[PDB]
Design a protein around this ligand. Structure first.
Ligand SMILES: [Ca+2]
Length: 351
DNA sequence: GATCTGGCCTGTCTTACACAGTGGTAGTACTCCACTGTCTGGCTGTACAAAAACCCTGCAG
């Protein structure tokens, strides 16, 4: 629980406030970049390295038989555990296009090989969605669950632009909470199913969810319709029966008022929720620790690593999970004139 | 310790971005001075005729 100011040696204008961090098979891969893929790296995905505070960003590449992806803005992420038939998978859907727009498409990502010089080759595959597909949305959450004993995907949350009939020029950029009906997805086949929940009467965004032993727990839960940040955690439990995937839900009395959190898994289930915003302008300073058992969530705090007055006074911030007690956060920087490297970086560590 | 190779640096070539706006100066194409004498067409006192659109009336249905 201590921070360290970094400096990106170069390439300090390709990161945008919304983006994703995926640690898979060693190195960390950043997804989502300001502007369309520059011809430096038509991949649109960067390898990251942290050497003596220096932030180094390398170019990556996919296969020939791989699909090429638009750099989604703030998609949903799922770390599908390494198993048959294809270990290990990263399921993404569906973010916002840098050409400002949504894609209800769903991508599956894996690693291919190495090096031959420690270089990393990747592979992307779209999936047609037999559904009952959820329309395009963003800020939602996708998760993986393993129920008796097969693997399925749970999709819930997020908002979207106006319904297409109500798409109004002067209400175009506005966005309303997508209706609260969860979606169950088999990775194969891409048969998507919709399901209703009589207790989840409202959509929500940016609520970091967690999955464990085919049981899902939603923390956070900021909502537009009521301007509320209901701390109350939401648990649900699914049993994958053929062909009725039975589903149940339940309210928890207490969770936490977190919005767009950064989740670092340190142990197999020792998680720390790092930061976000506790109120509409009041960012969350403190850290929080959650132990995740079949008993459930178990809550505690840690010491908040002292934020230098720069970040502690900065209006907004964000970051991602470098993983394993380590995470990255960024600060919108000022200047006269702008450097224009307007983002400082704090590498934060647990223990 | 020899070898190799992706990734990085230098140098390269290409597409953008401020330079308007303000005053003094000059050539130059377009317009009233005075002097003129003349003509048309509005003005004016009533009386005379000609159109116009209705309102009554009368015959007709
Ligand atoms: Ca210009």
């Amino acid at each position: 629980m201590s921070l360290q100011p970094l400096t990106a040696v170069n390439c300090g204008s390709l990161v945008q406030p919304g983006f994703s961090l995926l640690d898979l098979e060693g190195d960390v891969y950043l997804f989502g970049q300001k502007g369309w893929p520059k011809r430096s790296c038509p991949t649109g995905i960067f390898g990251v390295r942290i050497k003596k505070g220096e932030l180094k960003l390398r170019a990556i590449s996919f296969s020939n038989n791989s699909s090429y992806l638009p750099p989604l803005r703030c998609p949903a992420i799922a770390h599908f555990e390494a198993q048959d038939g294809k270990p290990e998978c990263y399921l993404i859907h569906g973010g916002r296009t840098p050409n400002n727009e949504l894609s209800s498409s769903l991508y599956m990502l894996s690693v291919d090989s190495r090096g031959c010089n420690r270089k990393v080759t990747l592979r992307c595959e779209e999936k047609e969605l037999v559904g009952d597909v959820p329309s395009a949305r963003y800020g939602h959450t996708l998760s993986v669950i393993n129920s008796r004993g097969k693997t399925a995907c749970v999709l819930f949350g997020g908002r979207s632009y106006m319904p297409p009939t109500e798409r109004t020029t002067q209400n175009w950029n506005s966005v309303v909470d997508c209706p609260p009906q969860v979606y169950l997805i088999d990775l194969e086949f891409g048969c998507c199913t919709a399901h209703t929940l009589p207790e989840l009467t409202d959509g929500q965004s940016f609520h970091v969810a967690l999955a464990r032993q085919d049981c899902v727990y939603f923390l956070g839960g900021h909502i537009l319709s009521s301007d509320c940040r209901p701390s109350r955690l939401i648990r649900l439990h699914v049993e994958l029966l053929l062909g009725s995937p039975v589903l149940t839900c339940t309210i928890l009395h207490e969770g936490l008022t977190i919005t767009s959190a950064i989740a670092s898994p340190i142990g197999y289930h020792e998680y720390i929720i790092f930061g976000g915003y506790q109120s509409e302008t009041q960012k969350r300073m403190e850290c929080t620790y959650v132990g995740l058992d079949d008993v459930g969530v178990h809550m505690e705090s840690r010491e908040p690593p002292q934020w230098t007055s720069e970040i502690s006074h900065s209006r907004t911030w964000f970051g991602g999970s470098l993983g394993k007690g380590t995470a990255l956060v960024a600060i919108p920087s000022e200047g006269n004139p702008t450097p224009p490297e307007a983002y400082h970086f704090y590498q934060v560590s647990f223990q």
